[PDB]
Design a protein around this nucleic acid. Structure first.
Length: 179
RNA sequence: AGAUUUGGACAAACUUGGUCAUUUAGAGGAACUAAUUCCGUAGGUGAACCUGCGGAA
Protein backbone atom coordinates (compact mmCIF):
# COMPACT_ATOMS: atom_id res chain seq x y z
CA UNK A 1 0.00 0.00 0.00
CA UNK A 2 3.10 2.18 -0.30
CA UNK A 3 3.82 4.85 -2.91
CA UNK A 4 7.25 5.80 -4.26
CA UNK A 5 7.67 8.92 -6.40
CA UNK A 6 10.60 8.74 -8.82
CA UNK A 7 12.48 12.05 -9.14
CA UNK A 8 13.96 13.65 -12.28
CA UNK A 9 17.44 12.26 -11.52
CA UNK A 10 16.45 8.79 -12.79
CA UNK A 11 13.56 9.53 -15.17
CA UNK A 12 14.57 8.07 -18.55
CA UNK A 13 16.83 5.50 -16.85
CA UNK A 14 13.74 4.07 -15.18
CA UNK A 15 11.88 4.42 -18.49
CA UNK A 16 14.41 2.21 -20.28
CA UNK A 17 14.09 -0.33 -17.44
CA UNK A 18 10.30 0.06 -17.16
CA UNK A 19 9.81 -3.67 -17.80
CA UNK A 20 13.41 -4.86 -17.29
CA UNK A 21 13.13 -4.82 -13.49
CA UNK A 22 9.30 -5.05 -13.35
CA UNK A 23 9.19 -8.69 -14.53
CA UNK A 24 11.79 -9.81 -11.98
CA UNK A 25 10.02 -8.35 -8.94
CA UNK A 26 6.69 -9.66 -10.23
CA UNK A 27 8.27 -13.12 -10.52
CA UNK A 28 9.79 -13.14 -7.03
CA UNK A 29 7.33 -11.04 -5.00
CA UNK A 30 4.35 -10.22 -7.31
CA UNK A 31 3.48 -6.80 -5.94
CA UNK A 32 0.50 -5.05 -7.55
CA UNK A 33 2.10 -1.97 -9.13
CA UNK A 34 2.03 -0.20 -12.49
CA UNK A 35 3.98 2.56 -14.24
CA UNK A 36 1.62 5.37 -13.21
CA UNK A 37 3.62 8.10 -14.92
CA UNK A 38 0.69 10.55 -14.86
CA UNK A 39 1.55 11.56 -11.28
CA UNK A 40 5.19 10.37 -11.70
CA UNK A 41 4.72 7.91 -8.83
CA UNK A 42 4.18 4.16 -8.55
CA UNK A 43 1.88 2.64 -5.93
CA UNK A 44 2.77 -0.91 -4.87
CA UNK A 45 0.51 -3.18 -2.81
CA UNK A 46 0.27 -6.84 -1.87
CA UNK A 47 -1.47 -9.02 -4.45
CA UNK A 48 -4.56 -11.03 -3.45
CA UNK A 49 -2.93 -14.38 -4.32
CA UNK A 50 0.75 -13.61 -3.56
CA UNK A 51 0.61 -11.94 -0.12
CA UNK A 52 2.73 -14.61 1.60
CA UNK A 53 5.23 -12.05 2.96
CA UNK A 54 4.24 -8.84 4.80
CA UNK A 55 7.73 -7.47 4.19
CA UNK A 56 7.51 -8.09 0.44
CA UNK A 57 5.68 -4.78 0.04
CA UNK A 58 8.37 -3.17 2.19
CA UNK A 59 11.25 -4.85 0.33
CA UNK A 60 9.87 -3.87 -3.07
CA UNK A 61 9.42 -0.30 -1.87
CA UNK A 62 13.08 -0.20 -0.82
CA UNK A 63 14.14 -1.42 -4.28
CA UNK A 64 11.80 1.16 -5.83
CA UNK A 65 13.40 3.77 -3.57
CA UNK A 66 16.81 2.45 -4.62
CA UNK A 67 15.98 2.95 -8.30
CA UNK A 68 14.52 6.38 -7.50
CA UNK A 69 17.58 7.49 -5.50
CA UNK A 70 19.99 6.32 -8.23
CA UNK A 71 21.09 2.79 -7.25
CA UNK A 72 21.65 0.48 -10.21
CA UNK A 73 19.88 -2.79 -11.00
CA UNK A 74 22.81 -4.70 -9.47
CA UNK A 75 22.08 -2.96 -6.17
CA UNK A 76 18.37 -3.59 -6.76
CA UNK A 77 19.19 -7.27 -7.23
CA UNK A 78 21.12 -6.96 -3.97
CA UNK A 79 18.05 -5.20 -2.58
CA UNK A 80 16.11 -8.35 -3.46
CA UNK A 81 18.67 -10.47 -1.58
CA UNK A 82 18.79 -7.97 1.30
CA UNK A 83 18.78 -10.40 4.25
CA UNK A 84 21.71 -8.40 5.68
CA UNK A 85 21.73 -4.92 4.13
CA UNK A 86 20.68 -1.38 4.98
CA UNK A 87 20.39 1.95 3.16
CA UNK A 88 20.75 5.34 4.87
CA UNK A 89 20.18 8.47 2.78
CA UNK A 90 22.17 10.95 4.84
CA UNK A 91 22.23 14.21 2.87
CA UNK A 92 24.10 17.49 3.37
CA UNK A 93 23.53 19.86 6.34
CA UNK A 94 23.52 16.95 8.78
CA UNK A 95 27.19 17.60 9.48
CA UNK A 96 26.43 21.16 8.45
CA UNK A 97 28.97 23.49 6.85
CA UNK A 98 29.06 26.44 4.46
CA UNK A 99 26.92 25.82 1.39
CA UNK A 100 28.94 28.12 -0.87
CA UNK A 101 32.65 27.88 -1.63
CA UNK A 102 33.33 25.41 1.20
CA UNK A 103 30.71 23.00 -0.16
CA UNK A 104 32.39 23.15 -3.58
CA UNK A 105 35.73 22.38 -1.91
CA UNK A 106 34.01 19.59 0.02
CA UNK A 107 32.67 18.24 -3.29
CA UNK A 108 36.23 18.28 -4.60
CA UNK A 109 37.41 16.63 -1.38
CA UNK A 110 34.76 13.89 -1.54
CA UNK A 111 35.51 13.08 -5.19
CA UNK A 112 39.27 13.50 -4.96
CA UNK A 113 40.93 12.65 -8.27
CA UNK A 114 37.67 12.75 -10.27
CA UNK A 115 35.76 10.27 -8.14
CA UNK A 116 38.88 8.34 -7.11
CA UNK A 117 38.39 9.01 -3.38
CA UNK A 118 34.71 8.06 -3.56
CA UNK A 119 35.57 4.86 -5.44
CA UNK A 120 38.31 4.06 -2.91
CA UNK A 121 36.03 4.72 0.08
CA UNK A 122 33.32 2.58 -1.52
CA UNK A 123 35.57 -0.37 -2.38
CA UNK A 124 37.70 -0.50 0.78
CA UNK A 125 34.91 0.01 3.33
CA UNK A 126 32.63 -2.37 1.34
CA UNK A 127 29.73 -0.03 0.64
CA UNK A 128 27.88 1.56 -2.26
CA UNK A 129 27.96 5.33 -1.82
CA UNK A 130 25.53 7.25 -4.02
CA UNK A 131 27.18 10.64 -3.48
CA UNK A 132 25.21 13.45 -5.09
CA UNK A 133 26.04 17.16 -4.82
CA UNK A 134 24.30 17.13 -1.43
CA UNK A 135 22.79 13.65 -0.86
CA UNK A 136 24.84 10.60 0.12
CA UNK A 137 22.79 7.40 -0.16
CA UNK A 138 25.05 4.76 1.41
CA UNK A 139 24.05 1.09 1.16
CA UNK A 140 25.70 -1.73 3.06
CA UNK A 141 25.83 -3.68 6.29
CA UNK A 142 25.44 -2.32 9.80
CA UNK A 143 29.16 -2.00 10.48
CA UNK A 144 29.67 -0.95 6.85
CA UNK A 145 27.18 1.93 7.05
CA UNK A 146 28.71 3.02 10.38
CA UNK A 147 32.20 2.97 8.86
CA UNK A 148 30.84 4.82 5.83
CA UNK A 149 29.17 7.35 8.15
CA UNK A 150 32.29 7.85 10.27
CA UNK A 151 34.47 8.33 7.18
CA UNK A 152 32.29 10.99 5.56
CA UNK A 153 32.04 13.01 8.77
CA UNK A 154 35.84 12.79 8.99
CA UNK A 155 36.44 14.45 5.61
CA UNK A 156 33.88 17.23 6.08
CA UNK A 157 35.28 18.10 9.53
CA UNK A 158 38.92 18.27 8.45
CA UNK A 159 41.63 15.61 8.34
CA UNK A 160 44.84 15.16 6.32
CA UNK A 161 44.79 12.79 3.31
CA UNK A 162 47.41 10.49 4.84
CA UNK A 163 45.30 10.13 7.97
CA UNK A 164 42.16 9.01 6.15
CA UNK A 165 43.94 6.90 3.52
CA UNK A 166 45.66 5.12 6.37
CA UNK A 167 42.24 4.89 8.03
CA UNK A 168 40.40 3.28 5.10
CA UNK A 169 43.17 0.68 4.93
CA UNK A 170 42.78 -0.44 8.53
CA UNK A 171 38.98 -0.29 8.69
CA UNK A 172 38.99 -2.53 5.62
CA UNK A 173 40.87 -5.12 7.67
CA UNK A 174 38.69 -4.85 10.78
CA UNK A 175 35.39 -5.71 9.09
CA UNK A 176 36.91 -8.32 6.76
CA UNK A 177 38.36 -10.18 9.76
CA UNK A 178 35.78 -11.34 12.28
CA UNK A 179 37.44 -13.51 14.96
C1' A B 1 84.31 98.30 -50.04
C1' G B 2 87.77 94.30 -49.65
C1' A B 3 97.15 87.26 -51.20
C1' U B 4 101.69 88.59 -48.77
C1' U B 5 105.03 90.18 -44.60
C1' U B 6 106.37 91.06 -39.32
C1' G B 7 107.08 89.23 -34.57
C1' G B 8 104.80 87.97 -29.25
C1' A B 9 102.20 84.44 -25.95
C1' C B 10 98.75 79.72 -25.87
C1' A B 11 102.46 76.64 -27.12
C1' A B 12 100.03 70.72 -28.98
C1' A B 13 103.01 66.39 -29.91
C1' C B 14 108.05 64.87 -29.17
C1' U B 15 113.50 64.66 -27.59
C1' U B 16 116.87 64.65 -23.38
C1' G B 17 118.23 63.86 -18.53
C1' G B 18 116.90 65.11 -13.29
C1' U B 19 113.19 64.81 -9.41
C1' C B 20 109.44 62.49 -6.36
C1' A B 21 105.70 58.65 -6.15
C1' U B 22 103.57 53.90 -7.93
C1' U B 23 103.61 48.91 -8.59
C1' U B 24 105.60 44.37 -9.72
C1' A B 25 109.93 40.57 -11.81
C1' G B 26 113.36 36.03 -10.81
C1' A B 27 115.22 34.57 -6.49
C1' G B 28 117.57 33.83 -1.51
C1' G B 29 116.55 35.84 4.49
C1' A B 30 113.35 35.51 10.46
C1' A B 31 108.44 35.11 12.12
C1' C B 32 102.93 34.23 12.29
C1' U B 33 98.32 31.79 10.43
C1' A B 34 95.88 27.74 7.93
C1' A B 35 96.46 22.40 6.72
C1' U B 36 28.61 10.73 -9.94
C1' U B 37 23.54 10.43 -12.52
C1' C B 38 18.84 12.65 -15.03
C1' C B 39 18.08 16.77 -17.85
C1' G B 40 17.14 20.82 -20.72
C1' U B 41 20.77 23.27 -23.82
C1' A B 42 25.19 26.78 -27.79
C1' G B 43 29.40 25.01 -30.61
C1' G B 44 29.98 20.99 -33.18
C1' U B 45 31.49 15.89 -33.62
C1' G B 46 32.11 11.34 -40.13
C1' A B 47 27.69 9.89 -36.11
C1' A B 48 26.95 8.29 -31.41
C1' C B 49 28.10 11.64 -28.26
C1' C B 50 31.82 15.31 -26.61
C1' U B 51 33.55 20.45 -25.49
C1' G B 52 30.02 24.75 -22.99
C1' C B 53 25.60 27.21 -19.98
C1' G B 54 21.71 26.47 -16.44
C1' G B 55 18.87 23.25 -13.04
C1' A B 56 18.44 19.05 -9.60
C1' A B 57 18.09 14.97 -5.61
Amino acid sequence: SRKIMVPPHRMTPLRNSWTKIYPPLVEHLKLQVRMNLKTKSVELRTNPKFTTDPGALQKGADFIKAFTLGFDLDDSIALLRLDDLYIETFEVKDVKTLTGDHLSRAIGRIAGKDGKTKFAIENATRTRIVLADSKIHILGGFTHIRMARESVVSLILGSPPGKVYGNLRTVASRLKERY
